[PDB]
């Protein structure tokens, strides 16, 4: 039964900082990128759609253009880490990490952004 | 795209 976990389900970050939000999946021996799907979304906004070892950038909500990246050197340790640079007040909310590798699972992470001073 | 349901949340392509 394929399980996604999250070591932190709540991040409190400063406005304008960078943040990396993690979700974990099981990996063994080989990781065929051909079969791996990593999806990040928040509300109705696609952040990352990673299919065949390639981020697809046509689908990515405009608010996250040039700010959102999957850390792919991490996939091999079973880490699907979303990095967001220049955190905005609108980045606050509920994120979902979906990962498929023979069947699938998703977890929720809450981000809260402290406004300046 | 495909479309996936996990514990009553769905996920599609672009």
- Chain A residues inside the 8 Å CB shell of B9: 96, 106
A106 and A97 Cβ atoms separated by less than 8 Å: yes
Instruction: Using the structure block, give the residue that is written with the tokens 């065949």.
Output: A52
- Chain A residues inside the 8 Å CB shell of B7: 106
Q: Which residues pair with A113 in a beta bridge?
A: A13
Compute the nearest-CA separation of B8 from chain A (Å).
11
Resolution, given in Å to one decimal, reads 1.9
Check B9 against A58: CB less than 8 A apart: no
Domain residue extents for chain A: 1-117
Find how far residue A43's CA is from the centre of its chain.
13
- CA nearest to A64, candidates A80, A40, A37: A40
What's the distance, Cα to Cα, between the start and end of chain B in Å? 7
For residue A16, give every residue at least 6 positions away whose Cβ sits within 8 Å of its Cβ, in sequence order, or none.
Answer: A86, A87, A116
Q: Kindly state the tokens that stand for A43.
A: 């509300």
């Amino acid at each position: 039964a394929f399980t996604v976990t999250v070591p932190k389900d709540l991040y409190v970050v400063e406005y304008g900082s960078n943040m990396t939000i993690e979700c974990k999946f099981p990996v063994e021996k080989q990781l065929d990128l051909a079969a791996l799907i990593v999806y990040w979304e928040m509300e109705d906004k696609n952040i990352i759609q990673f299919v065949h070892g390639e981020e697809d950038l046509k689908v990515q909500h405009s608010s996250y253009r040039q700010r959102a990246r999957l850390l792919k050197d991490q996939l091999s340790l079973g880490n699907a880490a979303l990095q967001i640079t220049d955190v905005k007040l609108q980045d606050a909310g509920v994120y979902r990490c979906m990962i498929s590798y023979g069947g699938a699972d998703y977890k929720r992470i809450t981000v809260k952004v402290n406004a300046p001073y | 795209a495909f479309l996936f349901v996990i514990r009553d949340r769905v996920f599609r392509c672009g």
